[PDB]
Amino acid sequence: LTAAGAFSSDERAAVYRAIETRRDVRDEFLPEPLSEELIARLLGAAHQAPSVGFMQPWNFVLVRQDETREKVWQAFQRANDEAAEMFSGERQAKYRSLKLEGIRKAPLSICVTCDRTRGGAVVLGRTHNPQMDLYSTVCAVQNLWLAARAEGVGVGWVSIFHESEIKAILGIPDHVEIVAWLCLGFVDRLYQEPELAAKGWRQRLPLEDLVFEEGWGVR
Amino acid sequence: LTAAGAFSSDERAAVYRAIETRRDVRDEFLPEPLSEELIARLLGAAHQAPSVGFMQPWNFVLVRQDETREKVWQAFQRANDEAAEMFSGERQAKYRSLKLEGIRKAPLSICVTCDRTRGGAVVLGRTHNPQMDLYSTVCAVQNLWLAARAEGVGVGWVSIFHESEIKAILGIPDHVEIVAWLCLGFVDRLYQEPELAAKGWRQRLPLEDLVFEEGWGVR
Ligand SMILES: Cc1cc2c(cc1C)N(C[C@H](O)[C@H](O)[C@H](O)COP(=O)(O)O)c1[nH]c(=O)[nH]c(=O)c1N2
Ligand SMILES: Cc1cc2c(cc1C)N(C[C@H](O)[C@H](O)[C@H](O)COP(=O)(O)O)c1[nH]c(=O)[nH]c(=O)c1N2
């Protein structure tokens, strides 16, 4: 191991800047396809994420073809109606007015998976909680999300669809699970605050309400 | 929605630096306690994580008392002893030589949770995949992990426990699930590559093997 310490004041600010300004993008994606060098930098970042027992359970299916995107867009439309039907009156009306994906607008989509059987018969760290491999994959997703923000690339997560239908479309095996569908594209404008707060779905919760000292429910 | 901010070469390099150098810390934690201000910045960064339907399902239990950490350490011991028992021969020997936690060395611990019942009866984006809220919580963790690296704070995830025992120790409710137990503490020494790779458990997988074009298994 080597010497380490807090980043410089400027470096530190940049990190918090990416965390503080990245957004889930749906409708502002620009049309230019991302270059191979850019994609390589993003995947490289996701690959540097931590992983239970250093399992490195992720895979990335790069989707750029119009037909595939349209196919997946259709899978989303199918499931979203079912989703909306779960709400009523104002909310349902509101839910239907929201844009919850940019699958056809974003020139690139990445299906991020978790190979449930990678790592052998037993994987370190997953022995007592079977979901640790999926969690590891989400860590890869957040790293990508942040690096993309720094690159001027917007990212959007779309979790509204029947997984079995996406797996059939991409040919994903039974032993592999889809953790996230990400829509990517350059963006020149962003919402200063979560889009769902701006459109009155839910507001930012007070952080002081979520932190406890030594025991649950104790401030 | 307004003009997006643009990152300079240095700002961007800082983000990648945090991503490429953060480590899962087990044994390099220093004893200097973290300031209240510092902790606040870390939780703030965590709270800026994306969350399905903007559910914001997380809670953070700050643990600093020796008795509590000793109990969690014992819970870890029991769990780790049964984990090792899932391995045999040489692997078992190596598994037993690995340090998989810094519960008693790190001056601070944070039990990160996920309130499964927050967001009401139906949560946007979680309608077709019930694990979306848990994944959201992981995003907050990764944000905290990166921010910590920038502040010169080491962070380690400990997943080897029996959840029920930890919940009992902290008085965590049935409707709340534990996603991660993090050990935090200043560090001035970090490994250059994953400790688990250095110690011969698993090596870094070739990224080229995990990336497919348009369809699974397709190069
Ligand atoms: C696991 C998970 C799953 C989803 C999301 C997030 C996460 C963490 N989000 C994005 C979510 O709605 C979003 O984070 C906030 O509403 C936007 O916050 P920011 O603008 O990203 O800070 C999301 N957004 C969307 O429009 N359609 C979707 O299906 C999903 N699915
Ligand atoms: C969901 C999940 C759960 C755990 C981990 C990670 C993740 C993502 N890791 C850390 C893991 O072993 C480590 O990230 C890799 O071996 C290399 O990490 P870095 O590249 O050094 O961060 C971990 N480490 C450890 O010593 N004890 C543990 O119980 C766990 N649990």
Q: Where are the domains of chain B?
A: 1-193
CB-based burial label for A3 (10 Å; 0-12, 13-18, 19+): exposed
User: Which residue in chain B has the smallest CA separation from A150?
Assistant: B12
A41: chain B residues, CB-CB within 8 Å: 16
Q: How far apart are CA A176 and CA B6, in angstroms?
A: 37
Which residues of A define the annotated binding site? Answer: 22-26, 51, 100, 159
Resolution (A): 2.1
What is the fold of A1-193? Answer: NADH Oxidase (3.40.109)
Which pairs with CB-CB distance under 8 Å and at least 24 residues apart come from A78-85? A78/A161, A78/A162, A78/A165, A79/A160, A79/A161, A79/A162, A79/B127, A79/B128, A80/A160, A82/B127, A82/B128, A83/A160, A83/B124, A83/B127, A83/B128
Q: What is the largest CA-CA distance in chain B?
A: 60
Whether A54 contacts chain B with CB within 8 A: yes
DSSP string covering A129-169, please? Answer: -TTHHHHHHHHHHHHHHHHHHHHTEEEEE---S-HHHHHHH
Interface of B with A in 15-44 (CB under 8 A): 15-22, 24, 28, 41, 43-44
User: Which residue in chain A has the smallest CA separation from B218?
Assistant: A61
- Structure determination method: X-ray
Whether B109 contacts chain A with CB within 8 A: no
Cβ-nearest to A18 among B15, B180, B196: B15
Q: How far apart are CA B112 and CA B155, in angstroms?
A: 13
Q: How far apart are CA B190 and CA A2, in angstroms?
A: 5
Whether B107 contacts chain A with CB within 8 A: no
Interface of B with A in 159-218 (CB under 8 A): 159-163, 170-173, 176, 179-180, 187-192, 194, 196-197, 201-202, 204-205, 207, 210-217
Residue with tokens 């348009």: B214
Q: Regarding beta strands B58-63 and A211-213, do their DSSP bridges make them parallel or antiparallel, or are they unpaired?
A: parallel
Of the candidates A59, A183, A125, the one whose C-alpha atom is nearest the C-alpha of residue B157 is A125
